[PDB]
Amino acid sequence: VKSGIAVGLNKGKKVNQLTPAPKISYRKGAASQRTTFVRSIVKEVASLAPYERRLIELIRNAGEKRARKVAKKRLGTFGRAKAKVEEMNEIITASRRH
Amino acid sequence: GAYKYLEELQRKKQSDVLRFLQRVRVWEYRQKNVIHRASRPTRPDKARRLGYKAKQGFVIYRVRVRRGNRKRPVSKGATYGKPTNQGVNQLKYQRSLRATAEERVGRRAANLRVLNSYWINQDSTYKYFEVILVDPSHKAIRRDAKYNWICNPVHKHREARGLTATGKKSRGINKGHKFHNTQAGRRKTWKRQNTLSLWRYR
Amino acid sequence: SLIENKKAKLVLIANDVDPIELVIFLPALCKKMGVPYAIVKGKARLGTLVNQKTSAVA
Amino acid sequence: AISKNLPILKNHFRKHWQERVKVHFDQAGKKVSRRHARASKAAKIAPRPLDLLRPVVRAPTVKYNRKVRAGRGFTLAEIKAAGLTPAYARTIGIAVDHRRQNRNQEILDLNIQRLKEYQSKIIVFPRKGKAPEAEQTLSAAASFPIVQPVTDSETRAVEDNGESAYRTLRLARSDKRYKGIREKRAKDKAEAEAEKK
Amino acid sequence: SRISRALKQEGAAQKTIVVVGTVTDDNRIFEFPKTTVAALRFTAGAKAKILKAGGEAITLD
Amino acid sequence: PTRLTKTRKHRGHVSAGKGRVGKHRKHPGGRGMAGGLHHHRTNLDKYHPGYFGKVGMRYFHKQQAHFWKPVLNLDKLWTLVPEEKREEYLKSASKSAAPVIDTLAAGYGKVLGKGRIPDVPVIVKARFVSKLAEEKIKAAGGVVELI
């Protein structure tokens, strides 16, 4: 929404805004039956990576803070260490736990 | 669909199975020639994404390149000149290793036309590249319009000019704000913007 | 794909495939989708039953 | 080097510029070759115009938003509403531009009418046989110019309700700064700690 | 505009304003009074802006 | 014109008007702004100041459009009203029928109050205003609409 002036938070000119339909591309981050399933096959082959194994053994020990601080190094961004250490937890708790 | 597995398998590269199949293969190629003909592409997916087809005229050539930096040749380190350019050692040939592989097989297989290439393996000494090549002389290509383009004379040594994929990255040719200083072409934009342009009426 | 759709009653898999990865999964796949498979000798042999040189699967 | 109260000229001729000097003597004779090649199009093309019909679009930015302008092409919204396909729009010389999207009903109407006036004013030659020509108009932009829209009232009512534009703009500015601190000052004091209380 | 000021001087509202230079149009003023003005050159703005009032654009001859 | 240039007139005279002690050597003061801090500081401490060092913050990728806002003075203001249709308005708008001035469309941002408009009301439309500019329009009779 637009505040109807040059300066402000919402800013600027008032219009009949809506709507552009969501272009097909935008999507992508639907996993979709195929990719998940194939990935779920290729999770049962061929084990974890050697840092991912270092991860869940390190997660069972002093397992957070230390894990993300390692996975930031053995990945790149801290932003992806979130994803991976979070992913590890789900590989810990799904298979081994329960 | 076999490919989406292989596609999404290969990405697991420190995987127990791949690391085995890596170490075993990096032997096969270490013992073979430096530029030897692969009977069929050992990442058939990777291949066929990069315009490989299993039909006559298409080829795959493996090739090996030495890893590591370029040594500035200069006798004895005697660069001669402004200490800026005394740098001999930590010096990094701007075309990739991928490309150099594509290039080396290009000159070997002069009749072939590189189309793309893709990484296979590496080690200490070497990176390994499977290079896909195509025969514009050969007819299966020249007729069928999907490939036929590659037979034109403006694709003679695409690898050398940097019209390969690696080439275009290494030339620094994306769209956007992060690639001004090369976009049309590095030496082009320069030679456009390092020109005095004078009209009739000034 | 035929295995992916549960339609295969039985699959056979050549144990010699140079890009070994071409096949590796099929066991894991046939397991997941409840197909009985049997890794059998010769991509050569499957070729003859199906009139190709090789065949990798059948 | 240097001199009397004389301004600091920054000139760029320390490189070998005199190699890369380009003087457009051509200019005048290039024009000819453009006029001549535009004509050679027009004969080659024959009845059609040289230009595809292009849409109206509001330029970007603060500096230019007030202006309207001719964009690339027409969108798969504006065409679909005007009652044809992008595939076919191209055959009749309407510039389709897939990658533009449509967040303003008062621009679309500008376009949709523009397409409706185009599809009107043109005739299509049947593919089968007869081609009854009515000369060529060389440009679409000639026959379909980008006349700027209407925010108009010559005389109009005046209503001094004591808002104070300065005070409004000033305030609006204020709020935009202090939203961020004030929304954190909600989490402090009035929430979290008061929620604990 | 300036010309106008030089008229609004005391005991000079009817004097003939001799400029020797251009007389340029000025749209900051509005009510430019009815007057004679000799100038070397007027602009088509200022010649009209004088003549609209009932004034007289003259030249130095 | 070469005839008219002064070098023709010098012909004969030995030194081309460059003197004989001082010679006219090539770059006897360095080049193009050199010795700014050294042997030209004299000239750079008259005639320039400010000419070394870096006052003020940076702006990476300063696009010259967020910094648009071209001013319009209230004196000028009326010029944006059409030439023919002006005679009429400036002598009687009389409220509720005032000639709207879209300064934006006329290519201006801030209306910004230098001169002194007449008592005729206006209805200005503009992206910004000076406090005073408004004050001068309100007291005249019109208003500033924002946009």
PDB file of C-alpha atoms in Angstrom, chain C:
ATOM      1  CA  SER C   1      10.657 -45.538 -14.548  1.00  0.00           C
ATOM      2  CA  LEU C   2       8.769 -48.846 -14.785  1.00  0.00           C
ATOM      3  CA  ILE C   3      10.064 -49.569 -11.272  1.00  0.00           C
ATOM      4  CA  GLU C   4       9.200 -46.033 -10.148  1.00  0.00           C
ATOM      5  CA  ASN C   5       5.544 -46.762 -11.117  1.00  0.00           C
ATOM      6  CA  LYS C   6       5.519 -50.207  -9.341  1.00  0.00           C
ATOM      7  CA  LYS C   7       4.712 -51.830 -12.716  1.00  0.00           C
ATOM      8  CA  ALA C   8       7.774 -54.135 -12.942  1.00  0.00           C
ATOM      9  CA  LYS C   9       7.160 -57.730 -11.801  1.00  0.00           C
ATOM     10  CA  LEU C  10      10.873 -58.481 -12.082  1.00  0.00           C
ATOM     11  CA  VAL C  11      14.024 -56.604 -13.064  1.00  0.00           C
ATOM     12  CA  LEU C  12      17.418 -57.947 -14.074  1.00  0.00           C
ATOM     13  CA  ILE C  13      20.563 -55.971 -13.807  1.00  0.00           C
ATOM     14  CA  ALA C  14      23.911 -56.517 -15.486  1.00  0.00           C
ATOM     15  CA  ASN C  15      26.729 -56.699 -12.951  1.00  0.00           C
ATOM     16  CA  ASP C  16      29.225 -55.267 -15.504  1.00  0.00           C
ATOM     17  CA  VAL C  17      28.460 -51.632 -16.202  1.00  0.00           C
ATOM     18  CA  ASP C  18      31.524 -49.348 -16.587  1.00  0.00           C
ATOM     19  CA  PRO C  19      29.902 -46.221 -15.209  1.00  0.00           C
ATOM     20  CA  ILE C  20      29.010 -48.375 -12.200  1.00  0.00           C
ATOM     21  CA  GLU C  21      26.793 -45.613 -10.910  1.00  0.00           C
ATOM     22  CA  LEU C  22      24.420 -46.092 -13.911  1.00  0.00           C
ATOM     23  CA  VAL C  23      23.051 -49.021 -11.960  1.00  0.00           C
ATOM     24  CA  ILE C  24      24.154 -48.813  -8.250  1.00  0.00           C
ATOM     25  CA  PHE C  25      20.796 -47.406  -7.145  1.00  0.00           C
ATOM     26  CA  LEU C  26      18.532 -50.017  -8.802  1.00  0.00           C
ATOM     27  CA  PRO C  27      18.834 -52.441  -5.888  1.00  0.00           C
ATOM     28  CA  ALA C  28      17.956 -49.589  -3.503  1.00  0.00           C
ATOM     29  CA  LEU C  29      15.195 -48.543  -5.902  1.00  0.00           C
ATOM     30  CA  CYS C  30      13.720 -52.016  -6.442  1.00  0.00           C
ATOM     31  CA  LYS C  31      13.874 -52.402  -2.664  1.00  0.00           C
ATOM     32  CA  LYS C  32      11.967 -49.186  -2.054  1.00  0.00           C
ATOM     33  CA  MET C  33       9.207 -49.866  -4.650  1.00  0.00           C
ATOM     34  CA  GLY C  34       8.852 -53.582  -3.837  1.00  0.00           C
ATOM     35  CA  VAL C  35      10.262 -55.067  -7.041  1.00  0.00           C
ATOM     36  CA  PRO C  36      12.130 -58.339  -6.998  1.00  0.00           C
ATOM     37  CA  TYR C  37      15.387 -57.935  -8.875  1.00  0.00           C
ATOM     38  CA  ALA C  38      18.460 -60.050  -9.455  1.00  0.00           C
ATOM     39  CA  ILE C  39      21.893 -58.783 -10.366  1.00  0.00           C
ATOM     40  CA  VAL C  40      22.820 -61.161 -13.123  1.00  0.00           C
ATOM     41  CA  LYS C  41      26.043 -61.689 -15.070  1.00  0.00           C
ATOM     42  CA  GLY C  42      26.771 -60.050 -18.401  1.00  0.00           C
ATOM     43  CA  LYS C  43      25.488 -56.873 -19.874  1.00  0.00           C
ATOM     44  CA  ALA C  44      26.482 -59.098 -22.775  1.00  0.00           C
ATOM     45  CA  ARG C  45      23.812 -61.701 -21.980  1.00  0.00           C
ATOM     46  CA  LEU C  46      20.968 -59.291 -21.542  1.00  0.00           C
ATOM     47  CA  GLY C  47      22.003 -57.951 -24.965  1.00  0.00           C
ATOM     48  CA  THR C  48      21.292 -61.276 -26.661  1.00  0.00           C
ATOM     49  CA  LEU C  49      17.805 -61.752 -25.216  1.00  0.00           C
ATOM     50  CA  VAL C  50      16.941 -58.200 -26.312  1.00  0.00           C
ATOM     51  CA  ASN C  51      18.870 -58.022 -29.608  1.00  0.00           C
ATOM     52  CA  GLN C  52      21.219 -55.186 -28.551  1.00  0.00           C
ATOM     53  CA  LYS C  53      24.948 -55.412 -27.867  1.00  0.00           C
ATOM     54  CA  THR C  54      24.694 -54.531 -24.195  1.00  0.00           C
ATOM     55  CA  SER C  55      21.612 -53.918 -22.064  1.00  0.00           C
ATOM     56  CA  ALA C  56      22.506 -52.958 -18.472  1.00  0.00           C
ATOM     57  CA  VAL C  57      18.992 -53.713 -17.271  1.00  0.00           C
ATOM     58  CA  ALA C  58      16.092 -55.824 -18.339  1.00  0.00           C
TER      59      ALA C  58
END
